[PDB]
Amino acid sequence: SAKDERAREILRGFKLNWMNLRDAETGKILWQGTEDLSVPGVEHEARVPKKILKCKAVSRELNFSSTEQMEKFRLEQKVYFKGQCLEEWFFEFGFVIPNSTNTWQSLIESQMMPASVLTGNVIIETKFFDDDLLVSTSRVRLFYV
Numbered sequence: 001s002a003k004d005e006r007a008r009e010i011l012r013g014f015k016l017n018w019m020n021l022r023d024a025e026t027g028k029i030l031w032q033g034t035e036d037l038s039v040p041g042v043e044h045e046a047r048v049p050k051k052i053l054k055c056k057a058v059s060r061e062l063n064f065s066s067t068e069q070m071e072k073f074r075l076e077q078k079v080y081f082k083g084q085c086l087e088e089w090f091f092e093f094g095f096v097i098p099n100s101t102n103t104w105q106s107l108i109e110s111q112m113m114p115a116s117v118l119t120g121n122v123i124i125e126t127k128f129f130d131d132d133l134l135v136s137t138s139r140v141r142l143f144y145v
């Protein structure tokens with residue numbers, strides 16, 4: 001279908017360039033990377049400091065480029081522990097100019113399991129939408145260090 005073709009064009013033109021996480025209260029950087037975690041079909045890995053689990057809120061900056069125009073770029077993210085969804089998050093970016101590079105700031109705000117239990121057992125599944133069109137699904141396995 002035209003929508004399936006369109007999804008592939010958007011993916012083809014998309015790159016996640018860099019990204020970081022900060023304690024929202026203090027602004028202190030907890031993690032940063034330049035690996036494109038959005039790439040589908042391979043299991044990505046990331047190592048994050050265990051103190052992140054003590055943050056009431058985490059600020060994420062995500063820098064991306066897109067050759068394709070998007071009407072309503074957004075993300076759905078599911079936190080899975082041993083295959084069980086503990087949490088679902090929704091973030092909206094909105095309009096994306098074709099051939100632009102953009103920085104997107106988001107706030108991520110139950111009782112947390114210990115880092116030692118969680119480590120290597122947490123998968124973040126991220127879906128990349130333009131409105132209702134699914135562009136891609138990626139997975140990142142988290143280790144708490």
Ligand SMILES: Nc1cc(CN(CC2CCNCC2)S(=O)(=O)c2ccc(S(=O)(=O)N(Cc3ccc(Cl)cc3)C3CCCC3)cc2)ccc1C(=O)O
Pocket residue numbers: 016021031037038046048052053054055056057058060062077079086087108109110111112113118122124126138140142
């Ligand atoms: N309920 C739980 C939720 C989590 C997930 N954490 C969310 C934090 C937990 C501490 N309070 C603030 C929210 S987290 O700190 O581990 C966290 C997870 C994902 C992310 S992320 O979605 O921003 N990102 C994944 C990501 C981001 C963007 C894209 Cl495109 C793809 C993947 C990763 C984090 C490390 C490398 C980047 C940020 C923080 C863990 C355990 C439990 C539990 O019940 O025990």
